[PDB]
């Protein structure tokens, strides 16, 4: 609440609350958001505008890994990337099976990337029009680069899900950061199932004298 | 590839050579340095350097 701050924008959600670690980008974020939001708002969105920026309440200085998807779930986005509170979305179930297979945890009720120490789950674009992936790419473009570049000043490893969606990601970033692009959980031929990204991230962390991610912390029981 | 079992094998081998760092032949050191090169190119930046 003291480690939390807020700024005012000219369109819904009108107030953006943010953890101190985001302070250096907030002025620019306001300016960018003010120029596109009314276009954005003509559409019903996932998530709703009052949840667009709730992930800016997360600290960054304790973060070693960013796990990044291109945009929110087409429906039911909560403002927390990958979050599915009742564990219904295919992608979060698939990620969980990967972690189950890796860790040997077999009985679970949920999985959330946001309760894992050291992980910041992220959506590159912060909204889409309901039902339509990537439909707000054009609006989020400058903001998306701003915010991901900020994140990557802090994390050791960026893991992007979607070969096609992130084939050009290095171009959007300024300073190099360890970047793994794997399959999206919905990829053809069970390819995400074969992907060893979570294990790769941990080896890369070790190579960087960082503590590996305890992926089993994401399980909800 | 970036995210395959084959990539993980290479990174685990790199990590193992890094932890020893006590090369007693030309093969080990050139294997280390060439893995660093591959990892840097594949992942853009990694936390270990050539030696």
Numbering used by the authors:
A (entry chain B): -2 to 218
B (entry chain D): 0 to 50
Give the authors' words.
Vaccinia virus DNA synthesis relies on three proteins: these are E9, the DNA polymerase bound to its heterodimeric cofactor D4/A20. The function of UDG is to prevent accumulations of uracil bases in DNA molecules due to misincorporation of dUTP or spontaneous cytosine deamination by excision of the uracil moiety and initiation of the base-excision repair pathway. Here, we present the high-resolution crystal structure of a complex formed by D4 and the first 50 residues of A20 (A201–50) that are necessary and sufficient for binding.
His-D4/A201–50-WT as well as His-D4/A201–50-T2A (carrying a Thr to Ala point mutation at position 2) crystallized at pH 8.7 in space group P3121 with unit-cell parameters a = b = 92.6, c = 145.9 Å. Diffraction data were collected up to 1.85 Å for His-D4/A201–50-T2A and to 2.2 Å for the wild type complex. The structure of A201–50-WT is almost identical to the one of A201–50-T2A: the effect of the mutation is strictly local and affects only the mutated residue. Two His-D4/A201–50 complexes are present per asymmetric unit. The loop connecting the two helices (residues 20 to 27), which is not involved in the D4/A201–50 interface shows some variability when the two complexes of the asymmetric unit are compared (data not shown). When this connector region is excluded from a superposition, the Cα atoms of the two complexes present in the asymmetric unit can be superimposed with 0.29 Å rms deviation. In A20, two stretches of residues form the contact surface: residues 1 to 14 are located in the loop structure at the extremity of the fragment and within the 1st helix; residues 40 to 47 are located at the end of the 2nd helix and in the following loop structure. Likewise, in D4 two stretches of residues form the contact surface: residues 167–180 and 191–206 that are present within loop structures, a β-strand and a α-helix. In addition to the flat interaction surface, the D4/A20 interaction uses steric complementarity forming a tongue and groove connection involving residues Arg167 and Pro173 on D4 (the “groove”) and Trp43 on A20 (the “tongue”). The crystal structure of His-D4/A201–50 highlights the importance of several Leu residues (Leu7, Leu10 and Leu14) of A20 for interaction with D4.
